[PDB]
Amino acid sequence: SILDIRQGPKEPFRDYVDRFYKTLRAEQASQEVKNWMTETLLVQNANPDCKTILKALGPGATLEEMMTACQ
Amino acid sequence: SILDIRQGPKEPFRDYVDRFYKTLRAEQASQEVKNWMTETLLVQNANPDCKTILKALGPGATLEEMMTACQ
């Protein structure tokens, strides 16, 4: 179900982040899982432009940095 | 780096599974993270036909079942 959280073509990155972590919270994701999801599925399900930017940023970007990049 | 493990267009699913978990093992993924990755990124980075089959199978499929589906 986290799998179906995908950033909409005109959806601000911040709104997609809100929905992504809301879903993790409902699925009782541990902090460890949360860290992994942030570095993987959060990037993979971003929209084409944001996904591109996040991949350029690279793994180990913090959420703060991803949000800056895709604003 | 798990992010760059993607099933090749003619790559048997089993070979992609081998590479996917090898990479998790090198990144010292916990069992909890391993379970989450299996239900999410393993499916997301499968090739177009296999990804389609795995999504039809649905979340909560075991690896055994995913392997059966994409053989």
PDB file of N, CA and C in Angstrom, chain A residues 1-4 6 24 27-30 32-33 36-37 39-41 43-45 51 55 59, chain B residues 1-4 6 24 27-30 32-33 36-37 39-41 43-45 51 55 59:
ATOM      1  N   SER A   1       0.851  -1.253   0.000  1.00  0.00           N
ATOM      2  CA  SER A   1       0.000   0.000   0.000  1.00  0.00           C
ATOM      3  C   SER A   1       0.846   1.246   0.000  1.00  0.00           C
ATOM      4  N   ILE A   2       1.979   1.211   0.690  1.00  0.00           N
ATOM      5  CA  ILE A   2       2.968   2.253   0.457  1.00  0.00           C
ATOM      6  C   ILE A   2       3.342   2.332  -1.024  1.00  0.00           C
ATOM      7  N   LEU A   3       3.293   1.181  -1.684  1.00  0.00           N
ATOM      8  CA  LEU A   3       3.555   1.048  -3.096  1.00  0.00           C
ATOM      9  C   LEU A   3       2.652   1.909  -3.967  1.00  0.00           C
ATOM     10  N   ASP A   4       1.441   2.187  -3.496  1.00  0.00           N
ATOM     11  CA  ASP A   4       0.521   3.009  -4.254  1.00  0.00           C
ATOM     12  C   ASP A   4       0.527   4.488  -3.840  1.00  0.00           C
ATOM     13  N   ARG A   6       2.176   7.569  -4.763  1.00  0.00           N
ATOM     14  CA  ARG A   6       2.998   8.081  -5.865  1.00  0.00           C
ATOM     15  C   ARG A   6       2.785   9.582  -6.040  1.00  0.00           C
ATOM     16  N   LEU A  24       3.125   5.238   6.111  1.00  0.00           N
ATOM     17  CA  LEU A  24       4.055   4.445   6.927  1.00  0.00           C
ATOM     18  C   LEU A  24       3.603   4.350   8.394  1.00  0.00           C
ATOM     19  N   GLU A  27       0.964   1.949   8.891  1.00  0.00           N
ATOM     20  CA  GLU A  27       1.440   0.578   8.747  1.00  0.00           C
ATOM     21  C   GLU A  27       2.440   0.241   9.857  1.00  0.00           C
ATOM     22  N   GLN A  28       2.549   1.134  10.844  1.00  0.00           N
ATOM     23  CA  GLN A  28       3.462   0.975  12.001  1.00  0.00           C
ATOM     24  C   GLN A  28       4.914   0.702  11.626  1.00  0.00           C
ATOM     25  N   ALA A  29       5.387   1.359  10.580  1.00  0.00           N
ATOM     26  CA  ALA A  29       6.802   1.314  10.215  1.00  0.00           C
ATOM     27  C   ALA A  29       7.720   1.745  11.359  1.00  0.00           C
ATOM     28  N   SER A  30       8.672   0.896  11.693  1.00  0.00           N
ATOM     29  CA  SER A  30       9.739   1.240  12.619  1.00  0.00           C
ATOM     30  C   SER A  30      10.607   2.395  12.078  1.00  0.00           C
ATOM     31  N   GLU A  32      13.806   2.366  11.698  1.00  0.00           N
ATOM     32  CA  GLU A  32      14.730   1.736  10.768  1.00  0.00           C
ATOM     33  C   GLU A  32      14.076   1.604   9.385  1.00  0.00           C
ATOM     34  N   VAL A  33      12.843   1.128   9.343  1.00  0.00           N
ATOM     35  CA  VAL A  33      12.162   0.952   8.052  1.00  0.00           C
ATOM     36  C   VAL A  33      11.897   2.323   7.432  1.00  0.00           C
ATOM     37  N   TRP A  36      15.021   3.506   5.672  1.00  0.00           N
ATOM     38  CA  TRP A  36      15.179   2.785   4.394  1.00  0.00           C
ATOM     39  C   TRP A  36      14.174   3.257   3.300  1.00  0.00           C
ATOM     40  N   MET A  37      12.890   3.399   3.661  1.00  0.00           N
ATOM     41  CA  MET A  37      11.856   3.839   2.721  1.00  0.00           C
ATOM     42  C   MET A  37      12.169   5.238   2.164  1.00  0.00           C
ATOM     43  N   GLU A  39      15.041   6.533   1.651  1.00  0.00           N
ATOM     44  CA  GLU A  39      16.184   6.516   0.714  1.00  0.00           C
ATOM     45  C   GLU A  39      15.793   5.691  -0.528  1.00  0.00           C
ATOM     46  N   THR A  40      14.643   5.019  -0.507  1.00  0.00           N
ATOM     47  CA  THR A  40      14.388   4.131  -1.626  1.00  0.00           C
ATOM     48  C   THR A  40      13.029   4.415  -2.250  1.00  0.00           C
ATOM     49  N   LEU A  41      11.967   3.896  -1.625  1.00  0.00           N
ATOM     50  CA  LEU A  41      10.686   4.067  -2.217  1.00  0.00           C
ATOM     51  C   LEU A  41      10.238   5.525  -2.309  1.00  0.00           C
ATOM     52  N   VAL A  43      11.942   8.051  -3.170  1.00  0.00           N
ATOM     53  CA  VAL A  43      12.573   8.505  -4.414  1.00  0.00           C
ATOM     54  C   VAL A  43      11.941   7.812  -5.639  1.00  0.00           C
ATOM     55  N   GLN A  44      11.796   6.502  -5.548  1.00  0.00           N
ATOM     56  CA  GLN A  44      11.260   5.704  -6.664  1.00  0.00           C
ATOM     57  C   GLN A  44       9.839   6.117  -7.112  1.00  0.00           C
ATOM     58  N   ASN A  45       8.996   6.554  -6.164  1.00  0.00           N
ATOM     59  CA  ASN A  45       7.603   6.924  -6.455  1.00  0.00           C
ATOM     60  C   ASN A  45       7.384   8.436  -6.581  1.00  0.00           C
ATOM     61  N   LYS A  51      11.856  12.713  -9.240  1.00  0.00           N
ATOM     62  CA  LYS A  51      12.639  11.465  -9.177  1.00  0.00           C
ATOM     63  C   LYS A  51      14.036  11.724  -9.773  1.00  0.00           C
ATOM     64  N   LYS A  55      17.507  11.373  -7.685  1.00  0.00           N
ATOM     65  CA  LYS A  55      18.566  10.437  -8.100  1.00  0.00           C
ATOM     66  C   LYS A  55      19.875  11.159  -8.315  1.00  0.00           C
ATOM     67  N   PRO A  59      22.099   8.757  -2.894  1.00  0.00           N
ATOM     68  CA  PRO A  59      21.590   8.062  -1.692  1.00  0.00           C
ATOM     69  C   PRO A  59      22.287   8.656  -0.479  1.00  0.00           C
TER      70      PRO A  59
ATOM     71  N   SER B   1      21.642   2.357  -3.280  1.00  0.00           N
ATOM     72  CA  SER B   1      22.317   1.320  -4.152  1.00  0.00           C
ATOM     73  C   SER B   1      21.420   0.136  -4.404  1.00  0.00           C
ATOM     74  N   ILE B   2      20.625  -0.245  -3.413  1.00  0.00           N
ATOM     75  CA  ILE B   2      19.529  -1.156  -3.710  1.00  0.00           C
ATOM     76  C   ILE B   2      18.636  -0.594  -4.817  1.00  0.00           C
ATOM     77  N   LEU B   3      18.544   0.730  -4.856  1.00  0.00           N
ATOM     78  CA  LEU B   3      17.799   1.458  -5.853  1.00  0.00           C
ATOM     79  C   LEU B   3      18.241   1.166  -7.280  1.00  0.00           C
ATOM     80  N   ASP B   4      19.511   0.816  -7.462  1.00  0.00           N
ATOM     81  CA  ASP B   4      20.013   0.509  -8.784  1.00  0.00           C
ATOM     82  C   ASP B   4      20.024  -0.991  -9.109  1.00  0.00           C
ATOM     83  N   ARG B   6      17.882  -3.464 -10.646  1.00  0.00           N
ATOM     84  CA  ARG B   6      16.672  -3.498 -11.474  1.00  0.00           C
ATOM     85  C   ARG B   6      16.671  -4.735 -12.369  1.00  0.00           C
ATOM     86  N   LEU B  24      21.175  -6.363  -0.382  1.00  0.00           N
ATOM     87  CA  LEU B  24      20.682  -6.109   0.979  1.00  0.00           C
ATOM     88  C   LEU B  24      21.644  -6.642   2.053  1.00  0.00           C
ATOM     89  N   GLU B  27      24.488  -4.494   2.575  1.00  0.00           N
ATOM     90  CA  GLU B  27      24.118  -3.253   3.247  1.00  0.00           C
ATOM     91  C   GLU B  27      23.626  -3.542   4.669  1.00  0.00           C
ATOM     92  N   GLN B  28      23.804  -4.789   5.112  1.00  0.00           N
ATOM     93  CA  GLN B  28      23.394  -5.250   6.460  1.00  0.00           C
ATOM     94  C   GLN B  28      21.936  -4.970   6.807  1.00  0.00           C
ATOM     95  N   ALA B  29      21.057  -5.127   5.830  1.00  0.00           N
ATOM     96  CA  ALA B  29      19.617  -5.051   6.068  1.00  0.00           C
ATOM     97  C   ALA B  29      19.144  -6.030   7.143  1.00  0.00           C
ATOM     98  N   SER B  30      18.460  -5.512   8.143  1.00  0.00           N
ATOM     99  CA  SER B  30      17.777  -6.330   9.133  1.00  0.00           C
ATOM    100  C   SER B  30      16.672  -7.191   8.489  1.00  0.00           C
ATOM    101  N   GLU B  32      13.571  -7.283   9.358  1.00  0.00           N
ATOM    102  CA  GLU B  32      12.432  -6.389   9.218  1.00  0.00           C
ATOM    103  C   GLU B  32      12.546  -5.591   7.912  1.00  0.00           C
ATOM    104  N   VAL B  33      13.716  -5.038   7.642  1.00  0.00           N
ATOM    105  CA  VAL B  33      13.893  -4.240   6.419  1.00  0.00           C
ATOM    106  C   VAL B  33      13.789  -5.156   5.202  1.00  0.00           C
ATOM    107  N   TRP B  36      10.145  -5.698   4.373  1.00  0.00           N
ATOM    108  CA  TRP B  36       9.598  -4.499   3.712  1.00  0.00           C
ATOM    109  C   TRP B  36      10.089  -4.335   2.241  1.00  0.00           C
ATOM    110  N   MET B  37      11.398  -4.508   2.004  1.00  0.00           N
ATOM    111  CA  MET B  37      11.974  -4.384   0.663  1.00  0.00           C
ATOM    112  C   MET B  37      11.354  -5.405  -0.306  1.00  0.00           C
ATOM    113  N   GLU B  39       8.388  -6.585  -0.260  1.00  0.00           N
ATOM    114  CA  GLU B  39       6.989  -6.252  -0.600  1.00  0.00           C
ATOM    115  C   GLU B  39       6.973  -4.925  -1.385  1.00  0.00           C
ATOM    116  N   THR B  40       8.107  -4.234  -1.485  1.00  0.00           N
ATOM    117  CA  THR B  40       8.017  -2.919  -2.092  1.00  0.00           C
ATOM    118  C   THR B  40       9.023  -2.769  -3.223  1.00  0.00           C
ATOM    119  N   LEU B  41      10.282  -2.492  -2.867  1.00  0.00           N
ATOM    120  CA  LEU B  41      11.238  -2.262  -3.894  1.00  0.00           C
ATOM    121  C   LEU B  41      11.489  -3.476  -4.787  1.00  0.00           C
ATOM    122  N   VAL B  43       9.367  -5.488  -6.003  1.00  0.00           N
ATOM    123  CA  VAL B  43       8.288  -5.390  -6.992  1.00  0.00           C
ATOM    124  C   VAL B  43       8.490  -4.167  -7.910  1.00  0.00           C
ATOM    125  N   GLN B  44       8.776  -3.031  -7.300  1.00  0.00           N
ATOM    126  CA  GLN B  44       8.938  -1.772  -8.048  1.00  0.00           C
ATOM    127  C   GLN B  44      10.055  -1.809  -9.116  1.00  0.00           C
ATOM    128  N   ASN B  45      11.142  -2.547  -8.847  1.00  0.00           N
ATOM    129  CA  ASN B  45      12.293  -2.619  -9.758  1.00  0.00           C
ATOM    130  C   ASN B  45      12.314  -3.887 -10.619  1.00  0.00           C
ATOM    131  N   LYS B  51       6.815  -6.898 -13.081  1.00  0.00           N
ATOM    132  CA  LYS B  51       6.225  -5.887 -12.183  1.00  0.00           C
ATOM    133  C   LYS B  51       4.689  -5.976 -12.277  1.00  0.00           C
ATOM    134  N   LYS B  55       2.265  -6.914  -9.151  1.00  0.00           N
ATOM    135  CA  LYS B  55       1.216  -5.992  -8.683  1.00  0.00           C
ATOM    136  C   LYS B  55      -0.141  -6.655  -8.706  1.00  0.00           C
ATOM    137  N   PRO B  59      -0.010  -7.156  -2.394  1.00  0.00           N
ATOM    138  CA  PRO B  59       0.963  -7.032  -1.287  1.00  0.00           C
ATOM    139  C   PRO B  59       0.705  -8.168  -0.310  1.00  0.00           C
TER     140      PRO B  59
END
